[PDB]
């Protein structure tokens, strides 16, 4: 029986990591490098990562740029409308911890004050390749998930 549960986890994990549909908050500079990840050289679509997805068909939110206090409530609302399972990738110093505006009166010091974060991509900005490395790292995180194995043991 546990053999069945192990293989269904593999199946659903494979499907979810193989069809990661992102919503990008293109907040600032870092949005440019995610555009270069979609561009032909890296072609995120070839991994199953569609270029643009609506928030309600999205699986991963990519916070790409500085999150201000004025924008923080809007970002939380979009996260709360994401169907589950949902993941958050924080990309760039600004989103990671405030970066170069960390000491500003108007900047949230890291988007993890507003939403939970699964992957932190460092850089100002991270290169398109560095972002792609972070996306592939999120895929490996999903591969490790054991939702049914843990469900069967409750």
């Amino acid at each position: 029986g546990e053999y069945v549960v192990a293989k269904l986890d593999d199946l659903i994990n494979w499907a979810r990591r193989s069809s990661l549909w992102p919503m990008t908050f293109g907040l600032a500079c870092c949005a440019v490098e995610m555009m270069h990840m979609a561009a032909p050289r890296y072609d995120m679509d070839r991994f199953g990562v569609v270029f643009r997805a609506s928030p309600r068909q999205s699986d991963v939110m990519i916070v790409a740029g500085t999150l201000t206090n004025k924008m923080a409530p809007a970002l939380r609302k979009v996260y709360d409308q994401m169907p589950e399972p949902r993941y958050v990738v924080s990309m760039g110093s600004c989103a990671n911890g405030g970066g170069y505006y960390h000491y500003s009166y108007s900047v949230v010091r890291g988007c993890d004050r507003i939403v939970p974060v699964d992957i932190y991509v460092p850089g100002c900005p991270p290169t398109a390749e560095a972002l792609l490395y972070g996306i592939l790292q999120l895929q490996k995180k999903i591969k490790r998930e054991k939702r049914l194995r843990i469900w069967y043991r409750r």
Binding site: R147, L148, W151, R154
Partner: protein
């Protein structure tokens, strides 16, 4: 019977796919007036009236078999021209505008 079986299968399968879509183990333990233009209403009515004239034109492939071809062609062209006339009337009366 064949066609009813086809229709039943198509919509029964549609019903099944919709319900299984709505159901799955989630593994969890925890009347007024729209602010919408009168122009959009006029599109619907215009479609309706033209749709009624298309109904009158559908028999034309069969009507072309008649021996009264002179009458058939005159009435066929008459109906289309009047349909064109109503389009011309709407056009000139600013009825196909959106500004």
């Amino acid at each position: 019977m064949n066609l009813m079986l086809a229709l039943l299968t198509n919509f029964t399968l549609a019903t099944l796919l919709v319900i299984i879509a709505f159901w799955l183990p989630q593994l969890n333990v925890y009347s007024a007036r729209l602010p919408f233009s009168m122009k959009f209403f006029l599109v619907a009515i215009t479609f309706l009236l033209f749709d009624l004239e298309i109904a009158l034109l559908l028999p034309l492939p069969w009507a072309s078999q008649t021996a009264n071809l002179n009458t058939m062609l005159t009435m066929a062209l008459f109906l289309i021209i009047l349909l064109a006339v109503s389009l011309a009337y709407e056009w000139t009366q600013k009825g196909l505008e959106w500004t």
